[PDB]
Amino acid sequence: MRKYNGYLIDLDGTMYRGTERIDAASGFIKELNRLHIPYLFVTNNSTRTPEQVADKLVSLDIPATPEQIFTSSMATANYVYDLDQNAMIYFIGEEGLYKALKEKGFSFADENADVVIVGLDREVTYEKLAVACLAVRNGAKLISTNGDLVLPTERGLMPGNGAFTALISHSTQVKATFVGKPEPIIMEQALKVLGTNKNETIMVGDNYDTDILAGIRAGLDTLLVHTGVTTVEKLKEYKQQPTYSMKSLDDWKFL
Amino acid sequence: MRKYNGYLIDLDGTMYRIDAASGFIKELNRLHIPYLFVTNNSTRTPEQVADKLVSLDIPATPEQIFTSSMATANYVYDLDQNAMIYFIGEEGLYKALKEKGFSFADENADVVIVGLDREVTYEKLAVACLAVRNGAKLISTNGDLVLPTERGLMPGNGAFTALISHSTQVKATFVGKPEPIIMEQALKVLGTNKNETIMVGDNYDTDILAGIRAGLDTLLVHTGVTTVEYKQQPTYSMKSLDDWKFL
């Protein structure tokens, strides 16, 4: 009887910025739970495990289990696995991406890898990057968990995953396939895990350029919150608009 | 009397991958025509490059080597003699910058110089990006995307420059070939006029284009990158340095 029986909730943007937004998210998510509506959180983040993210949400009174956290690194692992579970993987990345690949039981290799996966590695080295280039020139498919050129830290704007992918792409003259938002691949992979139908699922977020655009491209209806008169006007000039725009999660009716 | 009285000569693929190169250079010495080797190489000192040439029976003194490191050090000196420098690179670049009198800094640098560092790290790249976002000028020794080795086609300095430029949204100023910066300097060092100077090389995309944009005649010998199989032709194209007639 509901139009939407599955929710993909963005973890990024400014969705949980400040106590008011945190409380609104708590209210919204608790309501989904009370209604027994399945939901999954989606993020491009590669520096926290599903367990850490869930522990964090729970501490903010937003109910989540590790199984409800879905990252671009997980989407990337799962996407590659469905295409060739016997591919030998070379990856650049940290514990999150390693774990997602481990979950899929991959074999790993260096210069003769079948697939090269580029994730953010804050201890990357020339040699790690060289092996990626060599494997790509040996015919490996080139996959990038996301395209972000910058990683915000307290030091300032550090090089992001996308910058490293650009290095490899430029050196090898091979284009990467990108998985994370704003690409639709992460959202199709999230839909797989959530288990609901595309036309009965909605993606909720508050960033258009990176986050909600992914849902639009993946063929999902979208709710963009934290909008205002000017941003709504701005979106009307773009090729694609979110399905709905509202000020607050508080305004959403469960249909 | 001769049309060309000065020679700028590429190393990588022209002088070595070859004893046609040796004969060519010695004939230059016998005809007493000055020459300068010009290389995008940012890792080696001129002493090391010259020694390698000697060991191959190619007459070269360190003073006849002009690298992208030396050119970059000169170029930065022209912009600001007192620049605080953050650099990524190896011995060659470090030495060139130090010899020029520069002091070094990190995130607070005035100028960020990107040269090849085969032991570069995330942190080294991050410092570069932070300095650039802080307002540092972004300079690169060379734009080569690949470094050919026995393992295969390794990432070259242009690939690392691209990472930094993409992350920071700041375009780099490139010094080495095919940019005219290294050429105009080399020309000053060689000391001959443009119309009597010829650039000799094997790669169209670096060597020949460098000559064209510097307004120099060019000689493309097919002993390296570019095959016989572009919008501007080199002045001359031949299969071997043995075919050159010393015009």
Taking alpha carbons only, the member of B103, B95, B109 closest to residue B141 is B95
The answer on A69 and A15 residing in a single domain is: yes
Which method, experimentally, gave rise to this model?
X-ray
Confirm or deny that B26 is annotated as ligand binding: no
Contact B51, B11 (CB under 8 A): no
Checking DSSP bridges between strand A177-178 and strand B173-174, what pairing results, if any? unpaired
Residues B38 and B188: their CA atoms lie apart, in Å, by 13
- The verdict on whether residue B100 carries a ligand-binding annotation is no
Q: How many Cα atoms sit within 13 Å of B29 on the Cβ side?
A: 12
Residue B72 Cα distances to A26, B78, B144, B187, angstroms: 56, 10, 15, 15
Rounded to an integer, what distance in angstroms lies between the CA atom of residue B246 and that of residue A90?
A: 52
Find, in chain B, the residue whose alpha carbon is nearest to that of A138. B152
Decide: helix, strand or coil at residue A142.
Answer: strand
Domain boundary among A179, A201, A233: A179
Q: Where are the alpha helices (DSSP H) in B135-179?
A: 157-168
Phi, psi for B10 (deg, rounded to 5): -70, 150
Q: Determine the residue of chain B that is closest to A154 in CA distance.
A: B130
* Shortest Cα–Cα distance, A232 to chain B (Å): 28
Interface test with chain B among A94, A111, A120, A157, by most B beta carbons within 10 Å: A157
From CA B219, how far away is CA B237, in angstroms rounded?
Answer: 6
Q: Are B238 and B47 in contact (CB under 8 A)?
A: no
One domain for residues B73 and B105: no
What was the resolution (in A) of this experimentally determined structure? 2.0
Nearest-CA distance B17 → chain A (Å): 20
Are residues B189 and B162 part of one domain?
A: no
HSE-CB for B172 with a 13 A CA cutoff: 27
Question: Which among A179, A201, A218 is the end of a domain?
Answer: A179
Whether residue B200 is found in the same domain as residue B237? yes
- B168 with B106, same domain: the answer is yes
Contacts of B152 in chain A (CB under 8 A): 111, 133-134, 137-138
Any long-range contacts for A230-236 (C-beta under 8 Å, 24+ apart)? A235/A208
Breaks (C-N over 2.5 A) in chain A follow: none
The answer to whether A198 is a known ligand-binding residue is no
Q: Which of A183, A197, A217, A165 is nearest to A79 (CA)?
A: A183
Q: Look-up: residue for tokens 């470090």?
A: B94
Same domain, B67 and B90: no
Facing A163 at nearest CB: one of B121, B152, B166: B166
In order of B77, B93, B102, B116, B195, the CA distances from B84 in angstroms are 11, 15, 7, 19, 38
Question: Which among B118, B145, B151 has the least Cβ separation from residue A126?
Answer: B118
Number of domains in chain B: 2
On whether A236 is known to bind a ligand per the annotation, the reply is no
SS3 A158: strand
Q: Is B78 a catalytic residue?
A: no
Interface of B with A (CB under 8 A): 107, 117-122, 125-126, 129-130, 133-134, 145-146, 151-156, 158-160, 162-164, 166-169
**Which chain A residue has its CA at the smallest distance from B127's CA?**
A158
Q: Which residues of B touch A122 (CB under 8 A)?
A: 122
Task: State how far the Cα of B149 lies from the Cα of B137, in Å rounded to an integer.
Answer: 31
Residue of A nearest to B166 (CA): A163
Q: Say which residue the tokens 């995330």 belong to.
A: B122
For B224-239, b/e burial (b = at least 16 CB within 10 A) is: bbbeeeeeeebbbbee
Structure tokens at B157: 């300095």
Within this chain, do residues B67 and B8 fall inside the same structural domain, yes or no?
yes
Q: Look up A10 and say whether it is catalytic.
A: yes
CA distance A162 to chain B (A): 8
Spatial distance between the Cα atoms of A121 and A144, rounded to a whole number of angstroms: 12
What's the CATH number where A210 sits? 3.40.50.1000
Provide the residue type at B130 as one letter: L
Contacts with B169 from chain A: Cβ below 8 Å: 149
Residue A253, class by beta-carbon neighbours within 10 Å (0-12 exposed, 13-18 middle, 19+ buried)?
exposed
Beta-carbon contacts of B47 under 8 Å, excluding residues fewer than 6 positions away, are B62
CA distance A58 to A174: 42
Phi/psi at A189 (nearest 5 deg)?
A: -70, -35
All residues of chain B having their beta carbon less than 8 Å from the beta carbon of residue A163 are 163-164, 166-167
Spatial distance between the Cα atoms of A246 and A15, rounded to a whole number of angstroms: 13
Query: Which whole-number Å values give the CA distances from B48 to A24, B62, B146, in the listed order?
Result: 66, 8, 22
Query: Which residue, of B155, B175, B195, is where some domain finishes?
Result: B175
Q: Are strands A150-152 and A244-245 parallel, antiparallel or unpaired?
A: unpaired
Distance CA B130, CA A120 (A): 17
Beta bridge partners of A10: A42
Is residue B119 within 8 Å of residue B78, measured between CB atoms?
no
Q: How far apart are CA B225 and CA B203, in angstroms?
A: 5
The helix or strand, by DSSP H or E, that contains position B55, with its residue range, turns out to be helix B46-55
Name every chain A residue with its beta carbon within 8 A of the beta carbon of B155.
Answer: 126, 129-130, 133, 167-168, 171
Q: What would the two tokens of residue B8 be?
A: 């700028």
Give the orientation angle of helix B180-190 with respect to helix B68-79, to 10 degrees: 100
Question: Which one of B125, B151, B155 has the shortest CB-CB distance to A171?
Answer: B155
CB contact under 8 A, A167 and B146: no
Q: Are residues B233 and B171 in the same domain?
A: no
How much of chain B is in helix, strand and coil states, percent to nearest 5? Answer: 40, 20, 40
Residue A26, exposed/middle/buried by CB under 10 A (0-12, 13-18, 19+)? middle
Nearest to A145 by CA among A93, A95, A72, A211: A72
Strands (E), chain A: 6-10, 39-43, 69-71, 88-92, 107-108, 115-118, 141-144, 150-152, 157-159, 177-178, 201-205, 221-224, 244-245
**A212 vs B13: CA distance, rounded Å:** 50
Domain of residue A67, residue span: 1-83+180-255
Alpha-carbon separation of residue A110 from A89, A209, B18, B235 (angstroms): 8, 35, 34, 44
Same domain flag for A165 and A184: no
Q: How many CB pairs under 8 A join A and B?
A: 89
Q: Is B30 left (phi over 0), alpha (psi -120 to 50) or beta?
A: alpha
**A41 shares a domain with A146:** no
Under 8 Å between Cβ of B196 and B235 = no
Measured between beta carbons, which residues in chain B are less than 8 angstroms from residue A124? 121-122
A12: annotated binding-site residue? yes
A188: closest CA of chain B, how far (Å): 28
Minimal-distance CA residue of chain B relative to A120: B122
What secondary structure, in 3-state letters, does B59-78 show? CCCHHHEEEHHHHHHHHHHH
CB contact under 8 A, B155 and A129: yes
Question: Tokens standing for B38?
Answer: 């010009």
All residues of chain A having their beta carbon less than 8 Å from the beta carbon of residue B122 are 121-125, 159
Query: What CA–CA distance (Å, rounded) separates B108 from B133?
Result: 10
Do A144 and A250 lie in a common domain?
A: no
Terminal-residue alpha carbon distance, chain B: 9
Residues 6+ apart with CB under 8 A from B187: B8, B194, B197, B214, B216
- Answer yes or no: do A78 and A184 share one domain: yes
Task: Give the whole-angstrom CA distance, residue B142 versus residue B42.
Answer: 8
Whole-Å CA distances, B193 to B71, B177, B184, B190: 19, 19, 11, 9
